Amino acid sequence: TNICPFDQVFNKTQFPSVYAWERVRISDCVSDYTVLYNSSASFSTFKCYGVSPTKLNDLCFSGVYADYFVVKGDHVHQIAPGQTGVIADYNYKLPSEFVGCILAWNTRTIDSKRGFYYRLFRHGNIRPYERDTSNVPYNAAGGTCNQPGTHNCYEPLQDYGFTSTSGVGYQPFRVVVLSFELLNAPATVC
Amino acid sequence: STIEEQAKTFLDKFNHEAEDLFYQSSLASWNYNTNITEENVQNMNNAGDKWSAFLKEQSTLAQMYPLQEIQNLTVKLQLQALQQNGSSVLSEDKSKRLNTILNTMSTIYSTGKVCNPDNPQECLLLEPGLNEIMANSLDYNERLWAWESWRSEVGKQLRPLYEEYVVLKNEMARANHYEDYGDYWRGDYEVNGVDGYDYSRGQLIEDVEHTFEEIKPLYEHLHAYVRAKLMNAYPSYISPIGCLPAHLLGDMWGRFWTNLYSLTVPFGQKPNIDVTDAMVDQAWDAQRIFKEAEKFFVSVGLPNMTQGFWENSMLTDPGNVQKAVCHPTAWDLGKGDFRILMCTKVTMDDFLTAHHEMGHIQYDMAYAAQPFLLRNGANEGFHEAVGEIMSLSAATPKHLKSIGLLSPDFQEDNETEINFLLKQALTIVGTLPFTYMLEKWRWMVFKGEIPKDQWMKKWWEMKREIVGVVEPVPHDETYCDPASLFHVSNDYSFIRYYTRTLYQFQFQEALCQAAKHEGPLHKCDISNSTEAGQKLFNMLRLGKSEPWTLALENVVGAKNMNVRPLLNYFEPLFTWLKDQNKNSFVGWSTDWSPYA
Ligand SMILES: *[C@@H]1O[C@H](CO)[C@@H](O)[C@H](O)[C@H]1NC(C)=O
Ligand SMILES: *[C@@H]1O[C@H](CO)[C@@H](O)[C@H](O)[C@H]1NC(C)=O
Ligand SMILES: *[C@@H]1O[C@H](CO)[C@@H](O)[C@H](O)[C@H]1NC(C)=O
Ligand SMILES: *[C@@H]1O[C@H](CO)[C@@H](O)[C@H](O)[C@H]1NC(C)=O
Ligand SMILES: [Zn+2]
Secondary structure, three states: OOEOOHHHHOOOOOOOEOOOOOOEEEOOEEOOOOHHHHOOOOOOEEEEEOOOOOOOOOOOEOEEEEEEEEEEOOOHHHOOOOOOOOHHHHOOOOOOOOOEEEEEEEOOOOOOOOOOEEEOOOOOOOOOOOOOOOOOOEEOOOOOOOOOOOOOEEOOEEEOOOOOOOOHHHOEEEEEEEEEEOOOOOOOEO | OOHHHHHHHHHHHHHHHHHHHHHHHHHHHHHHHHOOOOOHHHHHHHHHHHHHHHHHHHHHOOOOOOHHHOOOHHHHHHHHHHOOOHHHHOOHHHHHHHHHHHHHHHHHHHOOOEEOOOOOOOEEOHHHHHHHHHHHOOOHHHHHHHHHHHHHHOOHHHHHHHHHHHHHHHHHHHHOOOOOHHHHHHHHHOEOOOOOOOEOOOHHHHHHHHHHOOOHHHHHHHHHHHHHHHHHHOOOOOOOOOOEEOOOOOOOOOOOOHHHOOOOOOOOOOOOOOOHHHHHHOOOOHHHHHHHHHHHHHHOOOOOOOHHHHHHOEOOOOOOOOOOOOOOEEEEOOOOOEEEEOOOOOOHHHHHHHHHHHHHHHHHHHOOOOOHHHOOOOOOOHHHHHHHHHHHHHOOHHHHHHOOOOOOOOOOOHHHHHHHHHHHHOOOOOHHHHHHHHHHHHHHHHHOOOOHHHHHHHHHHHHHHHHOEEOOOOOOOOOOHHHHOHHHHOOOOOOHHHHHHHHHHHHHHHHHHHOOOOOOHHHOOOOOOHHHHHHHHHHHOOOOOOOHHHHHHHHHOOOOOOOHHHHHHOHHHHHHHHOOOOOOOOOOOOOOOOOO
């Protein structure tokens, strides 16, 4: 059986913003997680929920996903089952019965440019595993506005001003999230 | 739904949107201050105006959320800050006239020169020159020439301009629901809406006078001792029952008495403490000075410097062709960026001011988690007081022994203890009557109780009664002597220097008790004391979100400013001064004059 595509999605040239995350799919392959353990000091965050962090290589799943985006260092703790924040409300949500692992590392010398955005306001929290990619103005007293910068009308996308001179908490981080499904089904990834 | 939900949304977009612009504007100012080119200034002009134009537009629609329908206190503080009309209430032509008046005062003060008699070709300026004379001359007829000439050419040309400055800026305060301009500056100490912590604007006048009435017995004894020693220098120019002429105080305006130490040293055979020689022998550099001062703050529990502080700061003169401004400053660029600009030298003076600047940085980290509009000290006098108490502890002989600068074979005697206190007294205590009198003169002029034809008459009447300084030459109504100072001519408030002195000795006394210190207050060190740091950190992390009355109570346990700790610091000097003036007169008579 062939080798998992984990090294082709764990190291790319461009990453997307949080408001538009990708969902590359991993199936019908064998996988080796020792590659993510040799470079253990390069990851500032390695948290696994549901499954043990150590001794997970010998597991068999019915389906594995992968989502990757770029978020600041002050919003990394928001990616977890159970939180409110701003990302957990309007950008990326995780179900309370999530099982998987979350990875993040610092990329101060690559993603230090303007072009990364995130959502600020909306009408109501989104559902788990929901994707929103709208660019329509927002209001605090009605439905939709037609003039950002005008009373009670606001633009919902704020830029992540990224500079290498800023502090650690304001520097870019790349986050890759793995979701494991362990129900009764034929084994896809083992 | 309600009006508070729509007001928090406006305070959620602004904080994220303003912080981005404030970082870019502050980044262009850093480059010019470290690299002086005609191209670098262009970036500052381009970036700075973008931030300036950002605030007026944002504050325009912040006035449409009324303040009588909000009950959450942290939102009212931010909304009131952004609802300030400022100088935008005046008309289109009146605002311009006020603006050009201020630029004229800055120009005339900076480019003022005096040409000496008998030499009409070469003239003398202030920043160098006139100063040198008022710091290193003992000739009576030479100091008088420099004192009078500067006030006759620079001060006389500021008389018509200053009259318009009061009337054009009093109406700005009146339109802003203040009865005069003096009340504008007194609004920095106002607290409303909290039961048990209110502080009216008019209570600042009552408290300042109440505290000053307990300072005179110390001031008169030091005043009489200085007068006696100054009779030796000038044979037949000082009276034993009179005042002191204004041109014999070691500086041009009498603000500080530091330059009089040579003529008033109590024990001249014993030298002061200087560790410059010990530093150069051990090959200390600029990096070591800032490395040692960082260890001081870690011991008291406060955090240590960020990685970007070392990679980005400037701690040595660039040399070669790159130029820079050498004024020591502390920067808070935004987004967690902190740096220090300093042209460090291997001296004792530069070692102490490193602790002063690094103390400012620690304050900026404490309230970085607060909202953007609430990132400052409790009032105008809190930021400076925090830095001052750090330099006091590092200057103690016991601290210098620990860091290896002063040998353990150094014995401290009572003679050197008095010498240290008198040097401190000539700077701290000597300036208190000067600051209190000048602000009082400005306050009563704004109210209008001093008519325009009695400005100078009441200026020297208060000088002889509160400060006890007499003029050498009569000054009529065409002079504007108070305008000769930088703060008065360039529109800066002065009462922050009076409160900073009192706050800094309340902080020190409270922190020395937390460290369990026994003895005189001038030997107390706060190093290796976690309790002192924990007590101080509670005030620092509050910022502007809480009244300064409560923030002061977190450290000293009191709600109002007090002067008693100041006298405790200078108590040993008081006892020695009394034993010197037994066969002499204490006080001054107002009827004396050197011109009659
Ligand atoms: C690219 O990244 C992957 C995982 O992120 C790593 O296994 C691979 O070795 C990296 N490429 C190089 C040349 O190191
Ligand atoms: C300072 O400015 C000059 C402008 O000509 C530039 O050439 C130089 O590289 C600058 N120095 C630094 C350290 O950037
Ligand atoms: C003010 O609003 C903040 C919003 O987080 C809240 O935490 C705080 O308790 C409020 N203060 C008052 C006056 O209730
Ligand atoms: C502060 O000091 C502690 C203890 O030495 C150290 O672990 C930490 O990394 C230091 N932080 C910085 C960046 O100075
Ligand atoms: Zn300072």
